[model samples]
Target: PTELPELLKLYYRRLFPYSQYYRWLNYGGVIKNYFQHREFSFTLKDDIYIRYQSFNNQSDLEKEMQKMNPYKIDIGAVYSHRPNQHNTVKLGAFQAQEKELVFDIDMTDYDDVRRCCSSADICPKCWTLMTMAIRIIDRALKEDFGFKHRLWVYSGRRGVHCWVCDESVRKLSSAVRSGIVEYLSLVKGGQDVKKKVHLSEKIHPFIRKSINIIKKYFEEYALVNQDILENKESWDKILALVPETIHDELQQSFQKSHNSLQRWEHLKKVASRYQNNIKNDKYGPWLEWEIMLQYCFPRLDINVSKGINHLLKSPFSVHPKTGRISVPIDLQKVDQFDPFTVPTISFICRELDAIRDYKKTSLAPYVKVFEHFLENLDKSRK
Candidate 1:
């Protein structure tokens, strides 16, 4: 029966892993005046807003946070001058100097595909989209862009955030950042556009690799869970991608199919057969690729990735609505990550009270992984 403020205080003092938080924000002190210049915003209860908050060092940051006991925190870009002293600095003089290349994938963006939840609500049924997004994006960031350090955080509610903390990535110009996000954005157009993803005669290797990742989850996600092919409205959308010749044929076959899985298999077979018959026509292959992209391609908030100054919610910030702590996702066990299972602030505090010894409780595993992440950061610095 712990109160919100008391629980937050306990979390800041005992449960919140400040060491890992500092290590992430510090970034090995590679750049001049990096850590101290970074801005941290806090949103206290009753919508009390504070911004341009900067700390000289980790200890100072921890002390203020423990004292304030903010309900939420947001990590902003490093500024030219101390953010705390922004008022004294001349207008337009306080500029966002640098920050991690960040990407946000909110589930609300996938509302068309996810039937389970919409807006801020999320469930396991639709969570597969997040898993697919993280896997595809993580692979591309490392292999395609040569980024070595990437941290994935669950947005306490309905999304995931990626922070590309590699020094090289953080130093990328705005133009370069825009280019990277544009390259990854395959599904374009808003709700009005019938066909969001359009594939050309020649498919790029990057798109092919992304489709490969989507293929693994598309069956369970779209075919079974979403049941995209089972409904007339949804099936028509997929049908729009195919050539006119196969339109009637696919409709007939799809009508005979029992479920989305059967319909999907039927669609693929028809497309493959059509491809073999008309070797000159490329629409057959394009149709299949389009279906995959439409269903499973990572729907990114292009603005978040394209801008250098955009502020992403900090890794450990608590969601005001859910009260769940935004924690780092261990990619090694990404398949097992269940957002519903993450501990809320009140839940953790109550558990701590019951256990008496916090170190010996179920909470230890999460803290240990966070500690290990910090340890790895320390090793990288050496």
Candidate 2:
């Protein structure tokens, strides 16, 4: 394996897609100084944290990108004044004026639900959790909220990040931003609550819509792949969520159950008996859906979405630990995106020597996907 020091130099010099990256942050130059007002933070080798960096134009940004060859890059909200001048400006005057509504979902958040992998390590089985999240959240962002231009990116390691760049969404109040997160949040509570998900007597249309998406994945992902209910301790944690009335009934059936699918079958039928029987329990009929959601619903890092000043790692920034570049995820092809297939700095740098032209290498397809996104975004300008 080649060291990233040499690989990163080659990566930035001939490969980083600065034109489209600039177009993304600049927002088609619709508003003056839009890119200038945005803050770019870079982390250099040896952990030197440089903050409040701003650039004049694409060339200025590209020039510094090649010169410093930062190990990581982060994007922050467009401030009231240039972020670089924060020290010179009056204390309260420089504030976050606008930011793309962003959401981050990391694999570690799914540790309790995912049996195949834990924290930082993701296999095909658990990567489905990310795919499921993208479908649910992407639908809600578009169909429910009616916003366009959602750019999803692999975090280059164990998660994905979404940047909602619609002009109106960017200008939304922080309260409104938090409200959106609240609407999307279903898997709530920590160690304090045994049941992380609970549906009301009447399920909200949004929850119903989300459950529909979750149901498609539950059988294959949660049951067969994860074998979530096959393990004794795991099923115990699951049974704790249901009403105490059916615990003995389901636990007994599970004792004889051979696999996750059969265990789930027993669970669904057991919950059915108590349906609409208020005398016994009201939430039993809904247990099936609740369990489906609890395991697979998008567990957002809520603060990332709610904070206006939060700095998100840039789309093409390399994951310092993994050496994989944080690349744009094509929503249409999300299910097929294998994080393992994503080229590392060393891999791409070596390929460039044979191909000479950056576009001919493996990175071409991803850059094309990015440009396609930019095309759609640019089309909306009146």
Candidate 3:
């Protein structure tokens, strides 16, 4: 009674948005073999890993994908030679040429800071972290780096992935990718490092701008909703970043406040006296900013961006476990986005069976978002 394979076939056949998908990856046919040289890998139902798959044209790709009906498809880099003939070429001749400058930000990385749902589970409150990431990173990609074609996709289960597809961006070396990521990154160290971020005496415009974005949400997100200052134990974790000289005084003042917001206000009052002071008697100058960075900053999977040939989940691919489609996120209505409401593979399949038209289904809205993204990408050329 294994019926899921047929469900997958239906998904690939009628539901997969092949035209827009090809339009995105094909780069409007500007480069020779741009579509042909790209690598596509599929993981089969029984856990068979098929790698180095490429196609001649959009039609070729669409036909092969429908036939193979893999559990998941991962898009890789455009190679110097066709990925399909890696065996035919000399070992060093078939090398990765270029790829979209990508970034992967997952909720699992925020497990230590989050008191709500840990691991794969995400709440609307915790989802604000993802929103903050998109705001912070997306703005920097556009404003700082001048990348125009950034595609932000929900990962179907946990978090979001951004693809910076500017022609100049894709041609960047691994070192350049590392440099860009490092510049954008602030939350340093891991579980072992007690103090995550260190703000300079004069903060850079990027971090300053990012802090401003965080300020809009930190009170509601961290203080009131997440309630990082709600208890002595959790509150103690907060004071760990402060200078030991005023820890006792800050703790005593925090006890007088009724809620997290009040407790934070009390701490800010104390910070006013010693903020940015370097004297021996001065408490931690960067304590407040450090807390925001520790809890709210974007925690990126660095390796994903650093490697040129790393494969990322396709935009319309279904997460086998969640059954949710990995769809493009519309930045205009990002705050209202609910991953739970995203159309599932089965749901859309049923919708197609009944209506026989994807345009009428719940997926239509997300498809529209994808179309808008393509139109904007195409506009960059004109």
Superposed model 2: Cα runs more than 4 Å off: 275-284, 355-357
Q: Write the per-residue lDDT of candidate 3 for residues 151-243, one digit (tens) a residue.
A: 899999999999899898899999999999999999888888888888886779999899899999999999978999998989998888877
Clashes of 1: 0
TM-score of 2: 0.96
Model 3 stretches astray by more than 4 angstroms: 1-3, 275-285
Order the candidates by lDDT, highest first: 3, 2, 1
TM-scores for the candidates: 0.93, 0.96, 0.96
State the C-alpha lDDT per candidate. 0.82, 0.87, 0.88
Q: Residue 47 in candidate 2 has what lDDT?
A: 81
Error of 2 at 93 (Å): 1.0
Query: Judged by lDDT relative to the true structure, which candidate is superior, 1 or 2?
Result: 2
- The candidate 2 region of ten consecutive residues with least summed lDDT is 276-285
Cα RMSD for predicted model 2: 1.8
Note the residue pairs that clash in candidate 3: none
**How badly does each model clash, as a count of residue pairs?**
0, 0, 0
